[PDB]
Design a protein around this ligand. Structure first.
Ligand SMILES: [Cu+2]
Ligand SMILES: [Cu+]
Ligand code: NA
Length: 208
Protein backbone atom coordinates (compact mmCIF):
# COMPACT_ATOMS: atom_id res chain seq x y z
CA UNK A 1 0.00 0.00 0.00
CA UNK A 2 1.61 3.23 -1.11
CA UNK A 3 1.76 6.47 -3.04
CA UNK A 4 4.42 8.99 -4.10
CA UNK A 5 5.37 11.34 -1.23
CA UNK A 6 8.04 13.43 -3.04
CA UNK A 7 7.40 15.15 -5.34
CA UNK A 8 3.93 15.18 -3.76
CA UNK A 9 1.40 13.02 -5.64
CA UNK A 10 -2.35 13.64 -5.71
CA UNK A 11 -2.57 11.16 -2.77
CA UNK A 12 0.09 13.08 -0.78
CA UNK A 13 -1.74 16.42 -1.15
CA UNK A 14 -5.33 15.06 -0.95
CA UNK A 15 -5.19 12.04 1.35
CA UNK A 16 -1.99 12.06 3.41
CA UNK A 17 -2.13 15.84 4.07
CA UNK A 18 -5.64 17.27 3.41
CA UNK A 19 -8.83 15.35 4.33
CA UNK A 20 -12.18 16.55 2.99
CA UNK A 21 -13.99 16.48 6.38
CA UNK A 22 -11.38 18.83 8.01
CA UNK A 23 -9.06 20.59 5.54
CA UNK A 24 -6.41 23.09 6.80
CA UNK A 25 -5.62 24.34 3.22
CA UNK A 26 -7.88 25.19 0.23
CA UNK A 27 -5.53 23.34 -2.22
CA UNK A 28 -7.72 20.15 -2.52
CA UNK A 29 -11.08 21.99 -2.34
CA UNK A 30 -11.91 21.64 -6.09
CA UNK A 31 -10.86 17.94 -6.22
CA UNK A 32 -12.95 17.24 -3.05
CA UNK A 33 -15.97 19.24 -4.32
CA UNK A 34 -15.93 17.80 -7.88
CA UNK A 35 -15.74 14.24 -6.45
CA UNK A 36 -18.81 14.83 -4.18
CA UNK A 37 -20.63 16.40 -7.19
CA UNK A 38 -19.99 13.15 -9.18
CA UNK A 39 -21.38 10.93 -6.35
CA UNK A 40 -18.02 10.18 -4.66
CA UNK A 41 -17.79 9.89 -0.83
CA UNK A 42 -15.54 12.00 1.45
CA UNK A 43 -14.48 8.78 3.25
CA UNK A 44 -12.88 7.47 0.00
CA UNK A 45 -9.90 9.90 0.40
CA UNK A 46 -8.88 7.96 3.56
CA UNK A 47 -7.90 5.12 1.12
CA UNK A 48 -5.23 7.34 -0.51
CA UNK A 49 -2.74 4.42 -0.10
CA UNK A 50 -5.04 1.96 -1.95
CA UNK A 51 -5.02 2.78 -5.69
CA UNK A 52 -4.44 -0.90 -6.51
CA UNK A 53 -4.68 -3.72 -9.05
CA UNK A 54 -3.24 -7.24 -9.48
CA UNK A 55 -1.59 -7.24 -12.93
CA UNK A 56 1.51 -6.04 -14.84
CA UNK A 57 0.33 -2.38 -15.24
CA UNK A 58 0.40 -0.02 -18.23
CA UNK A 59 3.35 -1.78 -20.02
CA UNK A 60 0.92 -4.72 -20.55
CA UNK A 61 -2.68 -3.58 -19.75
CA UNK A 62 -3.67 -1.02 -22.46
CA UNK A 63 -7.48 -0.96 -22.18
CA UNK A 64 -8.21 1.07 -18.99
CA UNK A 65 -10.84 3.89 -19.15
CA UNK A 66 -8.93 5.86 -16.47
CA UNK A 67 -5.27 6.83 -15.96
CA UNK A 68 -4.55 7.71 -12.29
CA UNK A 69 -7.10 5.22 -10.82
CA UNK A 70 -6.15 2.59 -13.49
CA UNK A 71 -9.75 1.16 -13.26
CA UNK A 72 -8.49 -0.27 -9.93
CA UNK A 73 -10.11 -2.32 -7.19
CA UNK A 74 -10.88 0.02 -4.23
CA UNK A 75 -13.10 2.37 -6.32
CA UNK A 76 -13.54 3.02 -10.05
CA UNK A 77 -13.33 5.86 -10.82
CA UNK A 78 -10.79 6.75 -8.09
CA UNK A 79 -10.93 10.09 -6.24
CA UNK A 80 -7.61 10.69 -8.13
CA UNK A 81 -9.37 10.49 -11.56
CA UNK A 82 -11.61 13.52 -10.72
CA UNK A 83 -11.17 16.41 -13.21
CA UNK A 84 -9.93 19.44 -11.19
CA UNK A 85 -7.28 22.12 -10.78
CA UNK A 86 -5.20 19.75 -8.59
CA UNK A 87 -2.33 21.13 -6.44
CA UNK A 88 0.84 21.53 -8.62
CA UNK A 89 4.52 21.67 -7.52
CA UNK A 90 7.47 23.20 -9.33
CA UNK A 91 9.75 20.56 -10.86
CA UNK A 92 12.91 20.24 -12.96
CA UNK A 93 13.94 17.79 -15.71
CA UNK A 94 17.04 15.57 -15.56
CA UNK A 95 18.09 13.32 -12.65
CA UNK A 96 15.35 13.37 -9.93
CA UNK A 97 14.59 11.06 -6.96
CA UNK A 98 10.96 9.87 -6.59
CA UNK A 99 9.99 8.74 -3.06
CA UNK A 100 7.26 6.10 -2.66
CA UNK A 101 5.84 5.98 0.88
CA UNK A 102 4.97 2.31 1.56
CA UNK A 103 4.49 2.75 5.37
CA UNK A 104 0.82 1.54 5.25
CA UNK A 105 1.91 -1.74 3.57
CA UNK A 106 5.71 -2.06 3.39
CA UNK A 107 6.00 -4.90 0.84
CA UNK A 108 9.82 -4.53 0.34
CA UNK A 109 10.43 -8.31 0.21
CA UNK A 110 8.69 -8.92 -3.20
CA UNK A 111 8.90 -5.41 -4.72
CA UNK A 112 9.89 -5.92 -8.41
CA UNK A 113 9.59 -2.67 -10.39
CA UNK A 114 8.96 1.07 -10.34
CA UNK A 115 7.59 2.45 -13.65
CA UNK A 116 7.01 6.12 -14.61
CA UNK A 117 5.25 7.75 -17.57
CA UNK A 118 4.96 11.49 -18.36
CA UNK A 119 2.53 13.48 -20.48
CA UNK A 120 3.57 14.12 -24.11
CA UNK A 121 5.62 17.28 -24.67
CA UNK A 122 2.67 19.08 -26.41
CA UNK A 123 0.17 18.19 -23.62
CA UNK A 124 -2.29 21.01 -22.65
CA UNK A 125 -3.59 20.42 -19.07
CA UNK A 126 -7.45 20.62 -19.00
CA UNK A 127 -8.94 20.80 -15.47
CA UNK A 128 -12.50 19.96 -16.85
CA UNK A 129 -11.76 16.54 -18.36
CA UNK A 130 -10.13 13.30 -17.22
CA UNK A 131 -6.64 12.42 -18.40
CA UNK A 132 -6.60 9.98 -21.36
CA UNK A 133 -3.84 7.66 -22.60
CA UNK A 134 -3.50 9.99 -25.65
CA UNK A 135 -2.10 12.62 -23.15
CA UNK A 136 0.81 10.28 -22.18
CA UNK A 137 3.98 8.97 -23.81
CA UNK A 138 3.48 5.38 -25.04
CA UNK A 139 6.63 4.12 -23.24
CA UNK A 140 7.81 4.84 -19.69
CA UNK A 141 10.64 7.40 -19.20
CA UNK A 142 11.85 5.43 -16.12
CA UNK A 143 11.46 1.65 -15.62
CA UNK A 144 13.67 0.22 -12.87
CA UNK A 145 13.43 -3.41 -11.73
CA UNK A 146 15.12 -5.47 -8.98
CA UNK A 147 15.40 -9.18 -8.32
CA UNK A 148 12.31 -9.21 -6.07
CA UNK A 149 13.11 -7.76 -2.61
CA UNK A 150 16.86 -7.50 -3.38
CA UNK A 151 17.52 -3.74 -3.69
CA UNK A 152 21.31 -4.35 -4.21
CA UNK A 153 20.45 -5.54 -7.79
CA UNK A 154 19.65 -1.99 -9.14
CA UNK A 155 21.72 1.08 -8.18
CA UNK A 156 18.75 3.35 -9.14
CA UNK A 157 16.41 1.82 -6.46
CA UNK A 158 16.93 2.15 -2.67
CA UNK A 159 14.93 0.70 0.27
CA UNK A 160 14.68 3.12 3.25
CA UNK A 161 13.56 0.71 6.01
CA UNK A 162 13.56 3.48 8.68
CA UNK A 163 10.99 5.65 6.82
CA UNK A 164 9.28 2.73 4.94
CA UNK A 165 10.18 4.48 1.64
CA UNK A 166 11.40 3.29 -1.77
CA UNK A 167 13.66 5.91 -3.45
CA UNK A 168 14.00 5.62 -7.27
CA UNK A 169 16.35 7.85 -9.33
CA UNK A 170 15.04 8.69 -12.83
CA UNK A 171 16.07 10.85 -15.81
CA UNK A 172 13.01 13.15 -16.17
CA UNK A 173 12.48 14.28 -19.80
CA UNK A 174 12.74 17.98 -20.71
CA UNK A 175 9.29 19.58 -20.33
CA UNK A 176 7.79 23.07 -20.11
CA UNK A 177 4.64 24.16 -18.23
CA UNK A 178 2.10 21.84 -16.64
CA UNK A 179 2.50 18.05 -16.92
CA UNK A 180 1.48 14.85 -15.15
CA UNK A 181 3.64 11.89 -14.12
CA UNK A 182 1.80 8.53 -13.90
CA UNK A 183 3.72 5.98 -11.78
CA UNK A 184 3.43 2.35 -10.72
CA UNK A 185 4.92 0.28 -7.90
CA UNK A 186 4.68 -3.41 -8.83
CA UNK A 187 5.23 -6.48 -6.66
CA UNK A 188 6.34 -9.73 -8.29
CA UNK A 189 4.18 -12.55 -9.72
CA UNK A 190 3.33 -14.06 -6.24
CA UNK A 191 0.53 -11.39 -6.08
CA UNK A 192 1.19 -9.03 -9.05
CA UNK A 193 -0.17 -6.39 -6.64
CA UNK A 194 0.54 -2.93 -8.10
CA UNK A 195 -0.07 0.62 -6.75
CA UNK A 196 -0.64 3.74 -8.86
CA UNK A 197 0.22 7.40 -8.19
CA UNK A 198 -0.13 10.60 -10.30
CA UNK A 199 2.02 13.72 -9.72
CA UNK A 200 0.96 17.19 -10.99
CA UNK A 201 4.16 19.12 -11.87
CA UNK A 202 4.92 22.57 -13.35
CA UNK A 203 8.24 22.75 -15.24
CA UNK A 204 7.80 26.49 -15.90
CA UNK A 205 9.39 28.20 -18.94
CA UNK A 206 13.21 28.17 -18.96
CA UNK A 207 15.66 27.57 -21.86
CA UNK A 208 19.46 28.15 -21.94
CU1 LIG B 1 6.95 8.86 4.38
CU1 LIG C 1 -0.14 -3.09 0.58
NA1 NA D 1 19.88 -0.37 -4.99
Amino acid sequence: HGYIESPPSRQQHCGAEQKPDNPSSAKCDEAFANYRAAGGQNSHWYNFMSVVAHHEGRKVVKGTEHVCGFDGETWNPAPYDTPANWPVTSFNSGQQTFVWDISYGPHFSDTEELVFYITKPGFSFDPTRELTWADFEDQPFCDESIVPGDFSTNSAVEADMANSHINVTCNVPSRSGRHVIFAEWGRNEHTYERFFSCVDVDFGWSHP
